[PDB]
């Protein structure tokens, strides 16, 4: 079933690109880290 398996694999990879793009919250985990650091730094500056 080599041929079948190869097609299935290729199809799945193709969806990956679409998935990340469509779902805005896909990389939310990474984004959260960025926001928290920025948020903290703003507060420090504000305190002055």
């Amino acid at each position: 079933n080599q041929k079948l398996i190869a097609n299935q694999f290729n199809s799945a990879i193709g969806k990956i690109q679409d998935s990340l793009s469509s779902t805005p919250s896909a990389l939310g985990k990474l984004q959260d880290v960025v926001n928290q650091n920025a948020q903290a730094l703003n507060t420090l500056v504000k305190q002055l």
Partner: protein
């Protein structure tokens, strides 16, 4: 005293004291406006 620009200078403007480089500002300062301030209380821009 004569204005100095593009060099670190200690400046006293109308009773406001700060040490910073002075450069020409492209800010569209409104006429009524005299000082421009950043998030911090420090004055980002000053009118001669």
């Amino acid at each position: 005293t004569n204005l100095v620009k593009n060099k670190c200078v200690n400046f006293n403007f109308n009773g406001l004291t700060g040490t910073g480089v002075l450069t020409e500002s492209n800010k569209k300062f409104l006429p009524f406006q005299q000082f421009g301030r950043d998030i911090a209380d420090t004055t980002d821009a000053v009118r001669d």
